[PDB]
Each structure stands twice: as C-alpha cells, then as structure tokens.
C-alpha cells in the first residue's frame, strides 16, 4: 500500500508519496528507461491501495489497478465506491469485501462522463493539494455530482502526478494554492495513452515515433514530439502503459 497525509504536506513530501505511488506499481522491463506497466495481473494483486488522509486526518483508500494506474473505486469508512464499468465491477470482487455496502456511482470513470457529471470540463476546476484535501472530505460522505469533481481532483493529483513528472510538478507549486491545471497539463493527460504506445513502437525504430504525437508545451504552445530524444521522453513521462492495453 501506499499512503499520503494532507496535514503536513509539503512539495517534498507530495514528491516522496508520488514517487513511492510509482514504485508501487510492478514492471519486469523499462523503455528507454521508463517503466512498462504488465500486460496483466491475476486476481487482488492487479490492485494497489493508496490510504489519503486530509487536513483532519480522516482517510479514504482508493484502489488502483497496477497495469493502468485508473482509478477503481476508494473506501469511505464502511461504505465502498467504484464506477460504473467492467472494470470497476471486477476490481469489486477482489477490494473492500468488509464494507457494509457497495455503491456504483452513476457514471464511469472516463474524463469525458466525469466531466458531464461534474457539470464543468476540468480545464476549470482548480487542482493542487487543498482541493485534494477538498476531495478526500467530499468523498468522505457520498454525494455524486460532487464526487465527480472531487474525481477528477483525485485522478489528476495522484495517478497523472504518478504518470508525468511536470504534473507532479504542477500540483507542487500548488501544494498551498489550487489552479486550474495548465493546457501542458491536459495535454498530457490525454496523450498518456498515444506517447506510450509511440514510445513502445519506436524501439525497432531506432527511438524514432511511427506517428508523432502532438502537445502542449509548458509555454503554452503546439509542439510535434517525434522521438525518445525530446524531453517529454527522457525527463517527463514516468510510467507506460502496455500497448497489449491500448
Ligand atoms: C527528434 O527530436 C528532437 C527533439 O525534438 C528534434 O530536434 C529532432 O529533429 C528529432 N530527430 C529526429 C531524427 O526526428
Ligand atoms: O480512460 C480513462 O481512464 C481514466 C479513469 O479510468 C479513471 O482513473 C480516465 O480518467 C480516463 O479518461
């Protein structure tokens, strides 16, 4: 398991939790020295549980499945959470079984259903460690609209923090102060997927991308990643997910 506690936090000690997150979940081989997440892992040990704790020292625990770090559900005392999807319902088989009840949030966890629910694109919902501790109280005591923003605060501070070192990085210089996350920062977020597959087929292609994948740069403008010699590659992303998952 991994843990993190609000009451205390600092950017070094966000940075220690994220790094512990990333070292949690299994690789038996890196790409250009990057981590490759399993194709697959048999029954409860495909999950890892990641205890939060806000400003007041209550706590969820969210599970995380290890091969795509997405998030399944969390514990709220003795009531557990998952989302609306295969998935989800699977990962229910194998976490919280002593929870007193089960509660299937009307929605997925895609961004895109998440949003809807939430009533805002999360362009506009601030993130950073105050609106983590915000989430963590939301979650705490169900109410879905709210949950879903809380959702998309939970998701992007810890598993996009774990995936990419700039949004780790983003959510430091808001450990005290939330913002909305930069377009870098979204940009990211959706291409996670597409970067990680081009990273896996450019070995056979002397680190060069069969397609290339467009972003957002920390400047706020369009930039075209090519091969494993950008940045992005070598300094930013952390974790790949298996194209057998893509
Ligand atoms: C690879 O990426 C670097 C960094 O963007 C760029 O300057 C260079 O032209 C690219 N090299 C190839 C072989 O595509
Ligand atoms: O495809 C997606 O996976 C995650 C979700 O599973 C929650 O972690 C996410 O936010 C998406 O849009």
Do not use: C
């Not at 600092?10 to 939790?17: A, K, N, R």
């Not at 460690?129 to 949950?147: E, F, G, K, M, V």
């Amino acid at each position: 398991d991994v843990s993190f506690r609000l009451s205390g936090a600092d950017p070094s000690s966000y940075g220690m939790f994220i790094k512990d997150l990333r070292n949690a979940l299994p690789h038996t081989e890196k790409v250009y020295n990057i981590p490759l997440l399993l194709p697959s892992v048999s029954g409860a040990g495909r999950y890892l549980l990641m205890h939060l704790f806000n400003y007041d020292g209550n706590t969820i625990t969210v599970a995380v499945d290890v091969t795509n770090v997405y998030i399944m559900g969390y514990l709220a005392l003795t009531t557990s959470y998952f989302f609306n999807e295969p998935a989800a319902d699977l990962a229910s088989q194998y976490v919280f079984r002593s929870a007193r009840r089960k509660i299937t949030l009307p929605y997925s966890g895609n961004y895109e259903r998440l949003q809807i629910a939430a009533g805002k694109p999360r362009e506009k919902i601030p993130i950073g460690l105050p609106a983590l501790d915000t989430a963590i109280s939301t979650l705490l005591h169900y109410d879905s609209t709210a949950a879903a923003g809380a959702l998309l605060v939970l998701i992007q501070t810890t598993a996009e923090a774990a995936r990419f070192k700039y949004i780790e990085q983003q959510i430091q210089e808001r450990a005290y102060r939330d913002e909305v996350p930069s377009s870098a920062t979204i940009s990211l977020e959706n291409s996670w997927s597409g970067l990680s597959k081009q990273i896996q087929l450019a070995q056979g292609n002397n680190g060069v991308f069969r397609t290339p994948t467009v972003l957002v740069d920390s400047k706020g403008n369009r930039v075209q990643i090519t091969n494993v010699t950008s940045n992005v590659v070598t300094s930013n992303i952390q974790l790949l997910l298996n194209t057998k998952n893509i």
